[PDB]
Amino acid sequence: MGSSQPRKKIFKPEELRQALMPTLEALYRQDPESLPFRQPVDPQLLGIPDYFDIVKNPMDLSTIKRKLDTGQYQEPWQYVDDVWLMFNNAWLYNRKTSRVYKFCSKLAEVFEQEIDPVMQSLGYCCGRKYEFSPQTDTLDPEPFVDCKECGRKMHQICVLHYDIIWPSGFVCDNCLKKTGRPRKENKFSAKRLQTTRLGNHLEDRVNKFLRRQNHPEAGEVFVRVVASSDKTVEVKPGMKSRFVDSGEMSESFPYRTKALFAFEEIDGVDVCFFGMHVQEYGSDCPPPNTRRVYISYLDSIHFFRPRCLRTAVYHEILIGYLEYVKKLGYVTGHIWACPPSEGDDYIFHCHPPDQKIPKPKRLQEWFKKMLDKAFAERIINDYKDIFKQANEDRLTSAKELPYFEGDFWPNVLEESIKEKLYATMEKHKEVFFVIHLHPPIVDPDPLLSCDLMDGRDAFLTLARDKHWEFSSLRRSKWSTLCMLVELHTQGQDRFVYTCNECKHHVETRWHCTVCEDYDLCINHTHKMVKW
Numbered sequence: 001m002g003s004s005q006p007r008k009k010i011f012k013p014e015e016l017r018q019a020l021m022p023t024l025e026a027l028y029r030q031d032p033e034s035l036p037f038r039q040p041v042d043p044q045l046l047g048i049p050d051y052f053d054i055v056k057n058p059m060d061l062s063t064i065k066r067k068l069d070t071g072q073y074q075e076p077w078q079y080v081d082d083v084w085l086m087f088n089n090a091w092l093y094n095r096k097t098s099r100v101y102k103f104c105s106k107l108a109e110v111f112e113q114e115i116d117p118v119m120q121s122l123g124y125c126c127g128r129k130y131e132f133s134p135q136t137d138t139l140d141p142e143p144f145v146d147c148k149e150c151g152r153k154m155h156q157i158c159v160l161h162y163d164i165i166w167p168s169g170f171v172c173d174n175c176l177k178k179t180g181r182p183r184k185e186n187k188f189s190a191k192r193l194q195t196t197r198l199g200n201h202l203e204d205r206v207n208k209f210l211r212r213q214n215h216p217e218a219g220e221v222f223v224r225v226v227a228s229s230d231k232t233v234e235v236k237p238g239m240k241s242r243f244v245d246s247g248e249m250s251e252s253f254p255y256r257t258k259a260l261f262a263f264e265e266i267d268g269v270d271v272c273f274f275g276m277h278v279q280e281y282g283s284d285c286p287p288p289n290t291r292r293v294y295i296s297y298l299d300s301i302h303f304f305r306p307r308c309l310r311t312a313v314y315h316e317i318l319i320g321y322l323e324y325v326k327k328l329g330y331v332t333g334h335i336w337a338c339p340p341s342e343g344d345d346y347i348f349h350c351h352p353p354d355q356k357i358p359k360p361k362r363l364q365e366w367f368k369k370m371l372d373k374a375f376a377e378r379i380i381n382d383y384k385d386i387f388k389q390a391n392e393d394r395l396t397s398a399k400e401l402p403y404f405e406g407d408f409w410p411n412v413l414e415e416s417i418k419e420k421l422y423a424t425m426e427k428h429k430e431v432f433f434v435i436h437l438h439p440p441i442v443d444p445d446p447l448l449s450c451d452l453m454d455g456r457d458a459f460l461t462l463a464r465d466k467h468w469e470f471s472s473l474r475r476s477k478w479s480t481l482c483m484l485v486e487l488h489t490q491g492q493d494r495f496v497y498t499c500n501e502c503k504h505h506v507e508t509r510w511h512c513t514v515c516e517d518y519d520l521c522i523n524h525t526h527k528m529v530k531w
């Protein structure tokens, strides 16, 4: 296996030592925390024959200092990787309550805030050793990539490099200030996802809302509908033979499901922070589902900036949804406020460890607060929970309850035929909402075939494979970076162009500077370029 990198950056021992050992010194100065670490662990002094069967590679301050003094480190990452082995040996062998487990953690905390700046003016991203959170003994490591001119290794996630975006390879940031080069534009951006009138309504709505507070840290939000597709919900086999063979409810119900996500600009790059799947039952769907929308799933990662605006924006999105479908012609909407099972994530592959999953009452209350200003903003006229609504309308048949795909009710009914039930309704009153917003329906928006977001399973699965975690701000940015590459490139629709006056087909064409999607034939107010 041969090596080439003609003008590599090589660090001479004194360069490395002179820069890196200010950091080792900070660790030695921690008294008493550092004293079990100034020496290699001696299992016969400590009475733990355990150790070398458990820790297959001991490491300690003294060893790292001698490696540093003799020059056994060629690249700084080897120095960094050795102390993390020292910490990792500590955190492993010892119980999470040990004294030296803690000592270590204080040492880890100081090495974290010392190594990052040093490694940065050595031209590197951080001085951290990163590994992906466990899946179903081993962890997978964060990827690295090497600058095409430096040869110096950096965290793929730290510098957000992706070959599909920049196919000429990765080149570092100061080798571009010396190249005179600025980095080519990332054209695979959340904003540049295909725009739709639904998506525009919600981003246009929250955007000046955020200006309504004008907090300095706020950045742009892009809302995009990334998948849209006509589906049919089959009536499940219990109610199957008892209501449709009779002919009182339909065999299937046609709906249009959409998946839609919201992104914010953080540190200059798209971060995805909200996702939702809806079911829209139009005006030719027969009773009981006619003119009804339903929120299958909703999920969130909390890194929205600033956090004192976070939830407000979730609401304005939801508010904007009912505002949008009201006008298109929908009349009632239906929420099942059920908080995530397990450590089961609804949409996003791996939530932050310290993001709290609400108690159902908290989420119920949340949805009630959300609804209260839809009423007040003159948007919906009111809303009840399912019983102050079911028997206000005096429902008595099992066939009158809206019948949605994957909803609770189709399956409680499903094997209540197998074996009473108005009681199983009334226990779960506050988890199911019914929203009154108020001539056929028209979805102006086209259909977006994008299998990845055709239901929540495709996206979760692919992130698990590819370690697109939403665990931290930095991992969030990286899996947004790649989520968007998947949406842009391997979506299932490719585009025929039309010229807005001529009805006609175009390939050669002129496009407006500012119009949302406006081309016109060579065969007007706007500045146009030839595309």
Ligand SMILES: *O[P@@](=O)(OCC(C)(C)[C@@H](O)C(=O)NCCC(=O)NCCS)OP(=O)(O)OC[C@H]1O[C@@H](n2cnc3c(N)ncnc32)[C@H](O)[C@@H]1OP(=O)(O)O
Pocket (backbone or CB within 6 Å): 297, 298, 299, 300, 301, 302, 310, 311, 314, 336, 337, 338, 339, 340, 346, 356, 357, 358, 359, 362, 363, 366
């Ligand atoms: O930040 P929120 O407005 O998030 C609302 C969401 C519904 C988007 C969110 O909860 C989410 O990501 N849900 C994922 C799955 C889901 O909701 N599925 C249902 C689809 S119908 O508000 P939260 O409700 O998340 O919490 C706000 C504050 O309350 C604290 N908190 C949440 N959960 C808690 C539990 N179990 N115990 C104690 N406190 C809990 C959070 O820390 C939040 O407080 P801050 O001061 O903002 O940190």
Ligand code: NA
Pocket (backbone or CB within 6 Å): 091, 092, 093, 094, 095, 096
């Ligand atoms: Na342990």
Ligand SMILES: [Zn+2]
Pocket (backbone or CB within 6 Å): 124, 125, 126, 127, 128, 154, 155, 158
């Ligand atoms: Zn890094």
Ligand SMILES: [Zn+2]
Pocket (backbone or CB within 6 Å): 147, 148, 149, 150, 151, 152, 171, 172, 173, 174, 175
């Ligand atoms: Zn470089």
Ligand SMILES: [Zn+2]
Pocket (backbone or CB within 6 Å): 499, 501, 502, 503, 504, 520, 521, 522, 523
């Ligand atoms: Zn024309």
Ligand SMILES: [Zn+2]
Pocket (backbone or CB within 6 Å): 512, 515, 518, 524, 525, 526
């Ligand atoms: Zn025009």
